[PDB]
Symmetry: C2
Subunit: 196 residues, 2 copies
Amino acid sequence: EEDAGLVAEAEAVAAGWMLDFLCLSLCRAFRDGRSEDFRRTRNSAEAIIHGLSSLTACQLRTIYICQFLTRIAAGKTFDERITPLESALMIWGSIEKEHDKLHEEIQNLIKIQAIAVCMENGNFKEAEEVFERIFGPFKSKLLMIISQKDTFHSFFQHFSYNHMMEKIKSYVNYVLSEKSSTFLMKAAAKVVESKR
Amino acid sequence: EEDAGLVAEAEAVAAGWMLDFLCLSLCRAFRDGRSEDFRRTRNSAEAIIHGLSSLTACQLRTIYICQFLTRIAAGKTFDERITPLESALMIWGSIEKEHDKLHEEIQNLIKIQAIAVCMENGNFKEAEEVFERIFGPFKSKLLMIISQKDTFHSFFQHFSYNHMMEKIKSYVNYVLSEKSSTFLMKAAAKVVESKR
Ligand SMILES: COCC(=O)NCc1ccccc1
Ligand SMILES: COCC(=O)NCc1ccccc1
């Protein structure tokens, strides 16, 4: 007989398979709004990721998408001394991905919702602290909104939580379609289709 | 397209595959004495087991073997208000398995080591408490040994920690050989063999 190195290699291949499968499940639970399922899959993905010490460019992209969705899911709820949405913003700006229209739309919606979720929770001192960290005449208008506790300002209705979630969900559908063919999920589906 | 029920079924099949793979890895790490690898695989197995709500007779046996090895590995280190080895003893006596010579040998070695590890750590009041919970003229001899702090008594040399670990390791080799053919590890090895 038994070679330790070849067994460790087989375990690394299987960890790679489990990572893609759990990213796929995390994406579907996020899209579906299945919170408890998302929590469980996130816990599993995090544990499996600890079993890997070297990651390829594709695997790094996979773990960062998982970390990003984890912070987005904790958006209305931590070493950092920033908020979950501010942490999602840092991950989003560092993933190896195209900075296209969708990327910029998601970035700006997260920037504004990082402030709006603090106002929604009644913590306006924190909303000013988040604003200072992100931004830190457009800025003067946003800082006046927070100062006046003008939570339902028309600006916040265009840059809403629901709009942020919808744009992120559209991005998740592209990740979901790119990984729907990964080894583990594909083999699992073939077993279920044989039953039936 | 997309059926929620068929996707959930494919995820349950894949969780079942991951469970056997992680049990195999936990068994090899236990046999090899790779403590940090055992800790990581245990964390992964525990997270994956949370993703299952219904288990077959075979899967229940798998999770209980994992729980048993986890308590054995924590033997010298928790709802219960008993010790890790006492907890392993409860799992061992309830697994759906044959109560053969090896089973009885492992049971008795765990019973004595649950007391001896307390003496090894210098906690003799705890050694008496463990003795009372398990047992609770043979008993009178064991209670005299603990009372006299006679840690290196010849009885403890036949019913040693090393003998307990060796007998448990032989049992692990049977579990290891029964699962070496499971889907995930078998497919992982075929990929590594194609490289080499
Ligand atoms: C807090 O720092 C660690 C961290 O990023 N945990 C979140 C996570 C969720 C899912 C997969 C990997 C990681
Ligand atoms: C403490 O109660 C929960 C428990 O048994 N955790 C240990 C465990 C280790 C590996 C697989 C499943 C479980």
